[PDB]
Amino acid sequence: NLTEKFLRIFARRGKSIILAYDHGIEHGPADFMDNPDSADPEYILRLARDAGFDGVVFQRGIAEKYYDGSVPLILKLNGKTTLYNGEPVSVANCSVEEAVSLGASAVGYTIYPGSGFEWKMFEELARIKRDAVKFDLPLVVESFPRGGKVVNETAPEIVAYAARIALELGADAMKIKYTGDPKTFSWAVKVAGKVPVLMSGGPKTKTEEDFLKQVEGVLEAGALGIAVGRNVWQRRDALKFARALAELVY
Amino acid sequence: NLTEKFLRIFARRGKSIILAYDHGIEHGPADFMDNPDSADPEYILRLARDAGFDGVVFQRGIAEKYYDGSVPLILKLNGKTTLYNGEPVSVANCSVEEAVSLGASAVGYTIYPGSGFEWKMFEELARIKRDAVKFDLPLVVESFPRGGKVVNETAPEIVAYAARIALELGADAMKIKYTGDPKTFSWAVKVAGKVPVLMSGGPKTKTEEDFLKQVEGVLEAGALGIAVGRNVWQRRDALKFARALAELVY
Amino acid sequence: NLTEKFLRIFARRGKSIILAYDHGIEHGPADFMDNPDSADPEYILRLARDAGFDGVVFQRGIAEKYYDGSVPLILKLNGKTTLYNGEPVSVANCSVEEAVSLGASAVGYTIYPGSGFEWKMFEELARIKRDAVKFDLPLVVESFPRGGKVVNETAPEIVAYAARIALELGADAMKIKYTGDPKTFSWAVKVAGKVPVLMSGGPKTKTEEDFLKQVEGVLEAGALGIAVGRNVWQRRDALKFARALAELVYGG
Amino acid sequence: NLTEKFLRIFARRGKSIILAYDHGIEHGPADFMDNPDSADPEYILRLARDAGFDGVVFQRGIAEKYYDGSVPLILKLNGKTTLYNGEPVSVANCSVEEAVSLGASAVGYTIYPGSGFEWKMFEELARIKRDAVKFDLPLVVESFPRGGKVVNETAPEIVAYAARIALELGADAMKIKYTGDPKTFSWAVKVAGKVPVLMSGGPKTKTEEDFLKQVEGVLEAGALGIAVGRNVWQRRDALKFARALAELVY
Amino acid sequence: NLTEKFLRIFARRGKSIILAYDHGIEHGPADFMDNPDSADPEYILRLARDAGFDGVVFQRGIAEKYYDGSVPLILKLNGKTTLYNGEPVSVANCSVEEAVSLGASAVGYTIYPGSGFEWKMFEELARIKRDAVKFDLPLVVESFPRGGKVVNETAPEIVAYAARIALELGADAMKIKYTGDPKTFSWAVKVAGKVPVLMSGGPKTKTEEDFLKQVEGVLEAGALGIAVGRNVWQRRDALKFARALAELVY
């Protein structure tokens, strides 16, 4: 049971905080100027370790060049840029077998349900899922409906659809966007069933309290925890705030 | 003979009711708000068991996390969302071999004849059919003309075309839409030849009586039975109505 | 020499009549209302037998469920619908290896030269041709230019192009449309060289005599014979007319 | 060294004349009405032998049904039609291994630099080139820029680009179009470097003298020779003119 | 550690100059008319040797026909032409295995982040990266965002995105365009982290001083050095200028 394995590795305390760091490809390094140390993957690993978080999410190149075994790794297999204007699509740049060799304890794969290319990602996820089972690495589906009929990605029905799709396609754990309130988020959590839900952190909030309040809602909705990037490492007090997040979640 | 095997497993009483539950990907969880228990796959299994139905249709994720061997399983191999706006296409997210490992007694695969991508589904079905024969699992082709010249999915000529294509491509059983009357539906059944036809249930009807009359017409037309989802589990009296369906069909 | 194998199996009397029955996918069952028995593949087999024809053309599903070994089988490997609106394309739904298992004595594959997807069918045909040689099953290329610049599928130069393409791509036999006259059709036959030509029957003609006159033209032009569906099984007098075609084609 | 091999087989006299006969797919048989015997590949092989040319170029179907070993064969692996209206593309209908079995001493492959599908042919050529090396068959790249920014195919800078691309991608010999004069064409020859150049003959010229003057210019520019089709076999005095072309070139 | 291998071979003096010569396919031989000896790959090798540069970059055809082992080789695996009008895409015409057989010490692969075909290149690069690791050949990613939302290829934020993408995808070294000043260029170098950065030389500059100026800034920003083509071999004083560069960089 790969969900059970995911939880042993990434949620030993019963809840999970994963420090997300695939932004260098997904958004580019403009994200890193607020807190320039955030451009340095070594700083990110130290941060996750020092705050006592459960894991980090890296693309293959960051993992190859920097990963040192100090915190469990989720290897994000696919990746696209914001320079791309087409129907949303993100193809694997790394295989599950290579992820195993790079030290990963789980793999991550983004899908964009609704995209004109939704079929391309579903076709590839089939192969990645089969390999995840073969290599006994839990599969985290990052389910982000985008393109087609999707307008507001945080709409209650879109986030619930994202969660269900991830369960239906074989996710062992999933990452989805927060709806902005625990009632509607709890329905997303419900339709995910036996598969645990991590809230994607989102753009840096106006205040630290605003983010803390979102996290409180995520936990009240019954989610497993958070996959947070910017709301930690875009801050000059990243470690201080990370430790506050740890106190709340754990 | 995989048709004979399908009938032995799914039509032991001479007619068949399959409880369809791929809706979580195809339509999303808005289908589940009417009767919220329907979001829970365990409730669906209990429903199929308690109503005395012949099988359930699950996507791979639901099968992996929830399937318990209590009712024969049809593993629906492909899937798409309603968020998608292009020419209709649904690609496999699971292989026949993996379906066997998940406890399937048959596999399902949706095609959209007429679609600008009709070719992509015919190419893949070729590989699925070959694997179905190799693994001795019946193939249920869900034949739903859509896109292209199709403007009325329940027109007599369209449903008969759906049926015949399914036969031509190697289906061992098939699921098609009802034309709304037994005379025109009997022609679709005729052109399907030796391959048994299941009626797709469709949106929830205004009355239970309306659905029962459709089912009566399907049976008068010589179909094997129904693959029904919403018209059972979207009702708050799901089990009561399921038993009335069992009474009529068997 | 797979052309020689094709002729031995499908043209023992020196000319060939093949009963075509892929219509259930290509056109759908509206083709079958005129003579409802035509929807029953068992009727189609009895008809080919009783009329003394050389073969039948089936898609894989009809071959699997109905083929009984009684008349040689050409397994039509690809197939598309008329519901489709794109640039014409027909992809394989069956392999040559599976065709062998289904009792096929040859395989058929449609190409649409000129189509925006011309390349997709030529690419697949390459694999099917290699497999035909490996399994020693003759390949019948059904060459029907359509899409692109094609405005008249029975124009003399379009049919001759169709024929030449089939030869060039490795057909062991071919099926092409009739031009409507023996002089222009004999040029198509000529450019096909050593590869035998079968005339595709086409829509049911207004009279039986119109069809027999086309077939007469086809034979004068030096074609091997005909691959006919609707002009036989859309007729309520299917067997009577089929036997008339047998005497014209085999009798000379 | 497959260039040396090519030259040993197809240029033993130091110069080459190859009789091209892929026209039946590329242009269709309207090419053959001027001299109807030209539709008969047996006639074409006799012509090449009787004129003492170095080779013939056939598609797989003509090679299989007609090739008799009497003149060295270049198996043209791809082919498209003039009925086609899209971005120029020509895919392989034959493998290198099959070419060997059909008795080829070299393989030919057409590319259309600039085409919207340029990538499809480069992708394929990569595989063909690799196989050519494995089977020790020289690769003749037929380089014809078309589509994209290409307006005039016989412009000096386009013919030179054609020649250079062939060298860069691994051609052991190449075929390109004539620019119409020896000075500009000699620059194409130069940029081709160690890879010999064959002039593609083109449409039947108005007079036999016109073509002879072209071939002279070709030889003046330092090309290896010609790959000619129409300007020989579209002429009712094919053999007599072919012998004049042999006297000139050799 | 293939970065270290790259540096040992191509940066033994601590900085690097690579002579780039993939122009024959990328731009065509119009690039060669200024200095017609530049069309001769033997000349290019001589230049690299006599100026004491660290490598050359060749396409497979040039490597096969001309590479003599005299200067370390980067085998540029993909290639496109300027005749092409679609969304930018460059597919491999050579495998890593073949590059090893051709005598390569590293391989190069161009990506165009932002292109409608971004996914196609990312998919292919994944295979190339896996092979590079397998054959122990450093992978140089040439990261040139183009198409999509890219308006200005030398914009500070674009070049830095280019650098980060290369790191994330698994480059052992990278080649990017210069921003035109050292301050913004040092941000690109920083976000590249442990992966060394080579500046692409660009169009032949108006004066020799202008190019040196660019190079002075590139080194100031902390780049490893330059991959220069035109600004050396397009000059009629090529060898001299090349030796003035060698003086500056080393």
Ligand SMILES: O=P(O)(O)OC[C@H]1O[C@](O)(COP(=O)(O)O)[C@@H](O)[C@@H]1O
């Ligand atoms: O739609 P977005 O904002 O790009 O979200 C996707 C990004 O958010 C994450 O899931 C979590 O990071 P953040 O907390 O910074 O949002 C990243 O892994 C991913 O790249």
Ligand SMILES: O=P(O)(O)OC[C@H]1O[C@](O)(COP(=O)(O)O)[C@@H](O)[C@@H]1O
């Ligand atoms: O694509 P549509 O038209 O929504 O219908 C397809 C759906 O119908 C079914 O065949 C049967 O379910 P329903 O009885 O609820 O219609 C499902 O398996 C499938 O998802």
Ligand SMILES: O=P(O)(O)OC[C@H]1O[C@](O)(COP(=O)(O)O)[C@@H](O)[C@@H]1O
């Ligand atoms: O262009 P059309 O009319 O679809 O013709 C194609 C059909 O004709 C045939 O070649 C022969 O059948 P018909 O004699 O009915 O025309 C079939 O095998 C094929 O499906």
Ligand SMILES: O=P(O)(O)OC[C@H]1O[C@](O)(COP(=O)(O)O)[C@@H](O)[C@@H]1O
């Ligand atoms: O651009 P075109 O006219 O189609 O030229 C391509 C044709 O020319 C050739 O290279 C040589 O034949 P020709 O001498 O008749 O031009 C053929 O092999 C090829 O099919």
Ligand SMILES: O=P(O)(O)OC[C@H]1O[C@](O)(COP(=O)(O)O)[C@@H](O)[C@@H]1O
């Ligand atoms: O795609 P562009 O902008 O034409 O430039 C890329 C070219 O520049 C290089 O990276 C370096 O060569 P140059 O110094 O002449 O620019 C070449 O390898 C590459 O072909």
